[PDB]
Design a protein around this nucleic acid. Structure first.
Ligand SMILES: [Mg+2]
Ligand SMILES: [Mg+2]
Ligand SMILES: [Mg+2]
Ligand SMILES: [Mg+2]
Ligand SMILES: [Mg+2]
Ligand SMILES: [Mg+2]
Ligand SMILES: [Mg+2]
Ligand SMILES: [Mg+2]
Ligand SMILES: [Mg+2]
Ligand SMILES: [Mg+2]
Ligand SMILES: [Mg+2]
Ligand SMILES: [Mg+2]
Lengths: 177, 116, 50, 136, 79
RNA sequence: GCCUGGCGGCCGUAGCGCGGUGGUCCCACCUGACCCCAUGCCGAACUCAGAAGUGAAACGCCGUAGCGCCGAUGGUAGUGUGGGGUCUCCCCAUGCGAGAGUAGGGAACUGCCAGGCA
RNA sequence: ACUUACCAACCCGAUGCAAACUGCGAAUACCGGAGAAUGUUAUCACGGGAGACACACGGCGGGUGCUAACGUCCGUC
RNA sequence: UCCUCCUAAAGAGUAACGGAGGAGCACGAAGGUUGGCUAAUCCUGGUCGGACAUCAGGAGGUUAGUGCAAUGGCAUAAGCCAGCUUGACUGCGAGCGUGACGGCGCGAGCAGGUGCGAAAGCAGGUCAUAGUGAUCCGGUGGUUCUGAAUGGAAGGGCCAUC
C-alpha cells in the first residue's frame, strides 16, 4: 500500500531521470515475490512437511502449495509425485504488504552488519536470497516451535538487465550491504 | 502467447465444424469491443456480420465491452441472418469460455430465433 | 491371473445378468453399476460383484 | 587390430560388394595409396601394412587410416554339420571398392613416401597405386 | 539363443485408389496400423478403432498433401 | 488508395536472426475487482466493471543475404528389354535416369467480411 | 593453495560405414480408368471326372556355407 | 500356439535347426464425455542442498511420455490434471478386408434406452497391433418350445453363462 503509492509517486521518477527512458513503461516493475522452503525431509515423515506448510502459512497468510518431485532421482531417493517442498507466490496487495513487513523490520534484524549480498542477480533482473532463519519474521512465536528451518525469497522484475534491476532495488529501502 | 494459446484451444472445434460441413457463428471478443460473423461451410465467404465498431448499435449503448452490448450484437446478428434466410448455424466459442460475455450474444441470438 | 470372473445381477425381478471380471485383493468392495436391462427395457442397478 | 568398441548387432548378413568407392580424394595428407581392385581387407592386414610404412619412416610425418573394419565375419568349427544356427564371429573386415583411398602421409618427401607405400602394398592383398594431393 | 518365432498375417497395406470399390463405405483405402501419412480428409469417414479408413457412400478416392506438417489425407469425390 | 481486425486458401522462395518504425481508429499493454467466474496457493491465467496513461513489452509493417529454405544445365550412380566378356564383377544397343554438389533464386502470394483515414 | 611432459565429455570443421539408420530417392512391378488393333472366349460362374502335393538344372535378386560344392533354403523367368 | 522387426527383391504374400526381442496379462478407472495444460536436457541466481530434490529466469522445441517387447503413430494431442458419469449398453446392420475351411477383423446407418456438453456433437471399452482352446460331456439361471393314452412331472430344445 504505502510502498505501492511510493513507487507510483517518486522512485519511478528517480529511475526515469537516471536511465533517461523515453517511455514510463521502460521503468522496471515488480510482479511477484516467491516464497520457497523445500524442506526435503518429507522422505522421513509427513509431519515435517505439514509443520513446514504451517510455518510458511504463518508468514504468507492464506495457504502454501506443496510441490511434487519432477523425477525419481535415486541419488536423493525421491519418488515421482512425492511432495518434498512448499512454496507460495503472493501478488498484488498482499505482495506489497509482505514486502513492507519484510523490509521495514525483518531485514534490519538480518545481520545488520551484512544485510545480504549485493550481487545476487540471475542476469535478467531477478533478485533472490535465502533468509536461512525463519525466526526473523516474528508474526508467529518461535519459543514453542520445534525446528528452525530456513526460507528463501525471490523478487521477480521486468528489468531488462542486472543494472536496471539493481537500480530499481536500490530505489527501495533494500540496503544490499 | 495468449492469442496462440486461444487458437490452440479453439482449433479442434474450429475444424470439427468444417468436417461436419455447417455454417458457423464465430465470435471474437476483445476488452473494448466484440464481433460476430456467420461463416459459410467452406470457410471462405462471409454471409453476415455485426460488431460494436459500427455507428449503429454502438451509438445507442453505454460502453462497448459489456454483456449488454454483447446482447445487442447478438440481436443484430440474429436479425440479419434471418433476413438473409440462413438458419441452423453452429455457434463456436473460438477459445473463450462460454460463461462470460459470450454467454450473451449466444443467448440473445437463440431467443431471437437463430437455431443455436 | 488372480483376477476372477463375477456376474452382475439386475436389481429388477428379471433374471438377466451381465458378466465381467474384477480384482479381489485390491477392491473387495461390491461393484454397483447402472446398465440396460433388455427384459424390462430400462436402465437399472446391478449387484452381486464379489 | 582395429574393431568397433561396441556393436549394435553381433552378426551381419553377407551382402555383396558392388559399385565404386566414395572417398577417392587425398584430403588429409599430401600423398595417398588407393586401391584399384575390389575385395575384403582384414584388421590384421591393415595392422601389418600400417607397421610396414610406420617403420619405413621411423619417426617422420603423420599417417592417416581411411578404411576401418566394420562388419564381422563368422565361421563355424571344423567337424560341424551344416545348419544348427549361424557361425560365430572370428575377425573383422572392411569392404573396399576400386578407387578407395586407404592411407595418407603428409610430412615426408615423395621419394620416401613412394617406398613406404610400396612396402605397405607388398603386405596388402588388393593391388594399389600411389596418388598425389594435387588440387580440386 | 532362439530363432524363428515370427509373427504371421501382417494383414494389408493398400486396397485401392479411385473408383476401385466405390460402392458404399468400403473398408479399404488405408494402410492399417499406419495413421501417419493416411488421415481422414473429412470426405471419407474417420478411422476405426484400429486406424482403418473407409468411405461414406460412393465416389473416387484421391490422395492429397495439405496443411501444416505436410500430412497426406485421403478424400472421396461424392457423385 | 492505403492502415487495422476477423475468417480462409497455400504450408519454410511462406521461417529465424539483426536494424528501423506504428497509435485518429483498431490491437495490445493498462485501472479496479463488495459481485458473475477462478487459482491444488496467487485477478499470474480464466472472468467481470472501465478508459488515466504508454506503444516500453507483445503485435503489424519496412530494410538487411548471417543462417534456415528452394534450386537448374551438364556429368555420374542405378535400372527394364536384347546381346557379350577374363563372369564373387562388368561391357555394348536401346529406353528411363537419380541423390549429392555447382551457377542461381529467395526478406511470400492470395480470397471474403468489417472498421479508420479522401 | 598453485601446477600440469597426462586423459577427456559437449560443441565446431573435414572423412568414411549400416539387413534390423533415413532430413532423399529411381528403373521395374502392381491397382484403377479411357482408346485402336489383334487373339477359334483366350475371362468368369456352376456341375461330372481326375491326377498331383519326392522336382532338377541355367539366368537374375538374396539368406546359410568358405559370394566352396552337381550343398542347402526362398522370390521370378 | 500368439505378437513386433529384418531377411522380403519400393502393392499383398514368401522358406531355413536364419538374425534379434516379447505374450498366456492389467484397469471399476488406466473406460465415456466436458473443461483445462504441455516435455527431456542444459545454463545463470538462491539456507540447509550436494553432480543431481525444491524455487525464479533464460536457452532448447519433443532428443519427453505412453500400464508391458518392437514397429508405426500421437501437439489436434493418442501425453498431463480436474468435474460429472457407466456407451466396457440391448436388437440389427448396407458395405468391405483376410482366410482351403472352421473362422477372424473394420464398419457408416436404423430402433429402444442412457451419460457428458449451452449447443454442434461424442460415447457399442482402453493409441493400434500379443494376453489364447473347436467339438463332445456335463453344471447354474431364465423361458412357457416340446412333454410317448390324458393332466402333470422327468428328460430334451432355445437364450445367458461355467
Ligand atoms: Mg515338398
Ligand atoms: Mg523348390
Ligand atoms: Mg540343388
Ligand atoms: Mg512386401
Ligand atoms: Mg516386389
Ligand atoms: Mg510359394
Ligand atoms: Mg489409457
Ligand atoms: Mg479435451
Ligand atoms: Mg484418454
Ligand atoms: Mg496399448
Ligand atoms: Mg404323458
Ligand atoms: Mg431345461
Amino acid at each position: 500500500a504505502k510502498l505501492h503509492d511510493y513507487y507510483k509517486d517518486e522512485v519511478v521518477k528517480k529511475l526515469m531521470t537516471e536511465f533517461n527512458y523515453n517511455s514510463v513503461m521502460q521503468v522496471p516493475r515488480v510482479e511477484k515475490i516467491t516464497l520457497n522452503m523445500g524442506v526435503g525431509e518429507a522422505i522421513a515423515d509427513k509431519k515435517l512437511l505439514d509443520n513446514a506448510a504451517a510455518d510458511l502459512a504463518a508468514i504468507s497468510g492464506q495457504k502454501p502449495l506443496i510441490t511434487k518431485a519432477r523425477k525419481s532421482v535415486a541419488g536423493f531417493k525421491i519418488r515421482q509425485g512425492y511432495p518434498i517442498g512448499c512454496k507460495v507466490t503472493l501478488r498484488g496487495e498482499r505482495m506489497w504488504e509482505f514486502f513492507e513487513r519484510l523490509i521495514t523490520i525483518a531485514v534490519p534484524r538480518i545481520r545488520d552488519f551484512r544485510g545480504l549480498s549485493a550481487k545476487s542477480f540471475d542476469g535478467r533482473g531477478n533478485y533472490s536470497m535465502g533468509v536461512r532463519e525463519q525466526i526473523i519474521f516474528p508474526e508467529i512465536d518461535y519459543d514453542k516451535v520445534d525446528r528452525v528451518r530456513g526460507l528463501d525469497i525471490t523478487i521477480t522484475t521486468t528489468a531488462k538487465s542486472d543494472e536496471e534491476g539493481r537500480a530499481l532495488l536500490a530505489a527501495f529501502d533494500f540496503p544490499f550491504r | 502467447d495468449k492469442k496462440s494459446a486461444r487458437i490452440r484451444r479453439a482449433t479442434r472445434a474450429r475444424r470439427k465444424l468444417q468436417e461436419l460441413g455447417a455454417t458457423r457463428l464465430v465470435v471474437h471478443r476483445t476488452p473494448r469491443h466484440i464481433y460476430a460473423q456467420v461463416i459459410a461451410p467452406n470457410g471462405s465467404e462471409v454471409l453476415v456480420a455485426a460488431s460494436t465498431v459500427e455507428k449503429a448499435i454502438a451509438e445507442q449503448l453505454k460502453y462497448t465491452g459489456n454483456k449488454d452490448a454483447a446482447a445487442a450484437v447478438g440481436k443484430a446478428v440474429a436479425e440479419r441472418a434471418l433476413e438473409k434466410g440462413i438458419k441452423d448455424v453452429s455457434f463456436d466459442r473460438s477459445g473463450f469460455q462460454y460463461h462470460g460475455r459470450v454467454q450473451a450474444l449466444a443467448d440473445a441470438a437463440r431467443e431471437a430465433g437463430l437455431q443455436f | 491371473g488372480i483376477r476372477e470372473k463375477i456376474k452382475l445381477v439386475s436389481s429388477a425381478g428379471t433374471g438377466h445378468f451381465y458378466t465381467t471380471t474384477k480384482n479381489k485383493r485390491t477392491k473387495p468392495e461390491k461393484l454397483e453399476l447402472k446398465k440396460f436391462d433388455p427384459v424390462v427395457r430400462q436402465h437399472v442397478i446391478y449387484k452381486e460383484a464379489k | 587390430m582395429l574393431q568397433p568398441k561396441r556393436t549394435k548387432f553381433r552378426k551381419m548378413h553377407k551382402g555383396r560388394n558392388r559399385g565404386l568407392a566414395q572417398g577417392t580424394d587425398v584430403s588429409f595428407g599430401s600423398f595417398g595409396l588407393k586401391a584399384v581392385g575390389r575385395g575384403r581387407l582384414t584388421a590384421r592386414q591393415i595392422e601389418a601394412a600400417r607397421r610396414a610404412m610406420t617403420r619405413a619412416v621411423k619417426r617422420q610425418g603423420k599417417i592417416w587410416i581411411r578404411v576401418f573394419p566394420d562388419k564381422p565375419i563368422t565361421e563355424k568349427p571344423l567337424a560341424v554339420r551344416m545348419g544348427k544356427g549361424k557361425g560365430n564371429v572370428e575377425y573383422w573386415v572392411a569392404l573396399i571398392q576400386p578407387g578407395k583411398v586407404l592411407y595418407e602421409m603428409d610430412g615426408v618427401p615423395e621419394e620416401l613416401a613412394r617406398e613406404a607405400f610400396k612396402l605397405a602394398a607388398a603386405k596388402l592383398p588388393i593391388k594399389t597405386t600411389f596418388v598425389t594431393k594435387t588440387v580440386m | 539363443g532362439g530363432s524363428t518365432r515370427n509373427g504371421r498375417d501382417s494383414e494389408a497395406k493398400r486396397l485401392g485408389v479411385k473408383r476401385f470399390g466405390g460402392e458404399s463405405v468400403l473398408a479399404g483405402s488405408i494402410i492399417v496400423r499406419q495413421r501417419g501419412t493416411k488421415f481422414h480428409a473429412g470426405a471419407n469417414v474417420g478411422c476405426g478403432r484400429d486406424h482403418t479408413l473407409f468411405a461414406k457412400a460412393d465416389g473416387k478416392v484421391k490422395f492429397e498433401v495439405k496443411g501444416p506438417k505436410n500430412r497426406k489425407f485421403i478424400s472421396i469425390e461424392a457423385e
